[PDB]
Homo-oligomer: A and B are copies of this chain.
Amino acid sequence: YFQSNAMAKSEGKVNGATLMARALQQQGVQYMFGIVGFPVIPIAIAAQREGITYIGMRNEQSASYAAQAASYLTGRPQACLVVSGPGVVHALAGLANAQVNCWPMLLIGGASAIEQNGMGAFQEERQVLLASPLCKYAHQVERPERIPYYVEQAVRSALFGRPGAAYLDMPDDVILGEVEEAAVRPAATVGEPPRSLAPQENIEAALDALQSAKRPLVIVGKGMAWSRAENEVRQFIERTRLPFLATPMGKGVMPDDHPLSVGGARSHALQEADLVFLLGARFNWILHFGLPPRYSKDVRVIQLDLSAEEIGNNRQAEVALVGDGKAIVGQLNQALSSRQWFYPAETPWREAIAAKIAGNQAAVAPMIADNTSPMNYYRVYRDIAARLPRNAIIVGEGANTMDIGRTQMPNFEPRSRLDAGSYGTMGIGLGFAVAAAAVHPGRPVIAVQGDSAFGFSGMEFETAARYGMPIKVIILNNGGIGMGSPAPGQPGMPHALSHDARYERIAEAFGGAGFYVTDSAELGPALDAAMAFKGPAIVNIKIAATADRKPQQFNWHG
């Protein structure tokens, strides 16, 4: 009818939803995760018309988590789309997690019409006010002709400097409001984030300090992965022959099988190093604040970070390298060519690191070899690690499940491990997996979660099936939070869940493949069948209720 090409069409006007979609596409947004509804249905449809991939989720929580993981994987702010009111409130989880991890993110939240403000409109809410404490940038788009301006400013703010979350509030009457095409002020395309360099004397001072250290340690954080500095870091470590330690999501910047990794002697390396070189890593709880009882009280610090305000937190920095990871390590490699220095091939430090790695390997070897059922964590990961392709993207989530999987699942390329992060968040699991499968559909995506962690976002398995994402979900079920629990007229323990739950049947609700494992003899065949199945799958593994990690001198939290 009105879709006949023979009829006269106005064709001069454009509405806010369309301008938003074009601006997002211009600014490099390729993925949009969310849940539609009033008033954002036109936004999702217009985004699809511009070629943006829209992924409809089952909860805004996972959608806001998927958005920032896709941002991390692409190096580019990607979008989360939620409805007014509780849509935005649900998505506050992702804003908080993206702020704490320094990951970019664009949350687009619908709002009730401006003309109804004050009246008690449907899902009326002070949305910019609620989001502001968790965002680098948060603003309401008051008029549709200003959409290109706001999308450019929001993307730029989220991407430049220390990355973080941006929020755009889209009222209903702005989404549907129309303006003349020829009257809309265009906006420039946001390019690559600016890279800054360190002063030359800071470069030379860092090398001076490295040459003088008896027990140096390089710590590779996920700031280097975000900076895409892996080439420069690998050259720097190879030329200096310096021992290095990867952070949880810094794994892969250096290959985990590199002979200079101290990952198997982590506590001794932190305890005994006289100099620590922080590469895109913070002295927060992940690295135990750089302070006793985990470090020498007199540890010297070279700190490379883009955030000037981060320099010297908790432990003073002897040499500060403020700027971009890739750029500054490039400076170090250039300055190394004039020094002709490397850490000597034989030092007591190297011998102590090697002895500790072998001691820790012998401590967990019987647990890895133990075929008895119900299985311990290390036995389970023996079969899992042996079936992980070298280009896989690993999502890990839980307490023991995640921590033990971190040391038992090596990464050989950067940006290939996504876990609970600097916020210790449960609920990122399947959202991260959906984002990884959307961004890199040619690579296998394996999520290894505990039974508690799986419950936070397990409904998103339907999302993966609906979009043909062959995500492999492996659940390590001990029947509780961190540990199992003997079944109780006493009430159930607060940490207890269901040890006999058949989570794999959730995969069969949505056309995926489900596998249940209780004996070690079943694990191999089940994992083989799950990996070969052309589609998403769940392997539910009932592990020992009392299985625990390797004993250590220090508690992880302390």
Chain A residues engaging chain B, CB cutoff 8 angstroms? 34-38, 41, 44-45, 48, 53-54, 56, 58-59, 61, 85-86, 89-90, 92-93, 96-97, 100, 114-115, 117-123, 125-126, 128-130, 132-134, 136, 139, 142-143, 146, 149-150, 152-153, 156-157, 160-161, 188, 190, 193-199, 282-285, 289, 307-309, 311-314, 316, 320, 322-323, 327, 423-427, 452, 455-456, 458-459, 462, 465-467, 481-482, 491-498, 500-506, 508-511, 557
A526 to chain B, nearest CB (A): 17
Given contacts A120-B313, A323-B196, A497-B56, contact A125 B96 (CB under 8 A): yes
A48/B121 in contact, CB under 8 A: no
Chain B residues near A160: list those with CB within 8 A: 308-309, 311
- Looking at the complex, which one of B132, B197, B283, B458 makes contact with A196 (CB distance below 8 Å)? B197
Closest-by-CB residue of B relative to A424 is: B123
**A500 to B509 CA separation, bound complex (whole angstroms):** 9
A14 to chain B, nearest CB (A): 18
Residues of B within 8 A of A115 (CB): 142-143, 146
Known: A161-B308, A506-B506. 19 other contacts (CB 8 A): A36-B495, A38-B557, A48-B491, A59-B59, A59-B61, A85-B100, A89-B96, A92-B92, A96-B130, A114-B142, A115-B146, A117-B139, A118-B150, A119-B313, A120-B284, A196-B198, A196-B322, A466-B492, A505-B505
Known: A56-B495, A126-B133, A505-B505. A308 touches B194 (CB 8 A): yes
Residue among A194, A426, A504 with the highest chain B CB neighbour number at 10 A: A194
Q: Are A481 and B308 in contact (CB under 8 A)?
A: no
Q: Would you list the 7 A-B pairs with minimal beta carbon distance, nearest first?
A: A120-B284, A58-B455, A44-B494, A188-B316, A196-B196, A194-B322, A160-B308
Contact A119 B312 (CB under 8 A): no
**Chain B residue with Cβ nearest A81:** B494
Q: Is the CB of B56 within 8 A of A492?
A: yes
In the complex, 6 of the A-B residue pairs with CB atoms within 8 angstroms, ordered by the A residue number, are A115-B146, A156-B312, A195-B322, A196-B196, A197-B199, A506-B506
Q: Are B467 and A492 in contact (CB under 8 A)?
A: yes
Q: Looking at the assembled complex, report how far the CB atom of A145 sits from the nearest CB atom of chain B, in whole angstroms.
A: 9
User: Residues of B contacting A198 with CB < 8 Å?
Assistant: 196-197
- Expressed in whole angstroms, the minimum distance between the Cβ of A62 and any Cβ of chain B is 10
Cβ B188 vs Cβ A199 within 8 A: no
Q: Which of B123, B132, B314, B498 contacts A423 (CB 8 A)?
A: B123
Cβ contact within 8 Å between A118 and B139: yes
Q: Given A86-B93, A115-B146, A122-B557, A188–B56 Cβ distance below 8 Å? A: no
**Beta-carbon nearest neighbor of A283 in chain B:** B120
With both chains docked as a complex, state the minimum distance between the C-beta of A53 and any C-beta of chain B, in angstroms. Answer: 7
Chain B's closest residue to A425 (CB) is B86
Contact A501 B509 (CB under 8 A): yes
With A115-B146, A282-B120, A426-B86 as contacts: A491 and B311 at CB distance below 8 Å: no
Q: Which of B36, B161, B312, B493 makes the CB contact (< 8 A) with A188?
A: B312
Q: Are A90 and B119 in contact (CB under 8 A)?
A: no
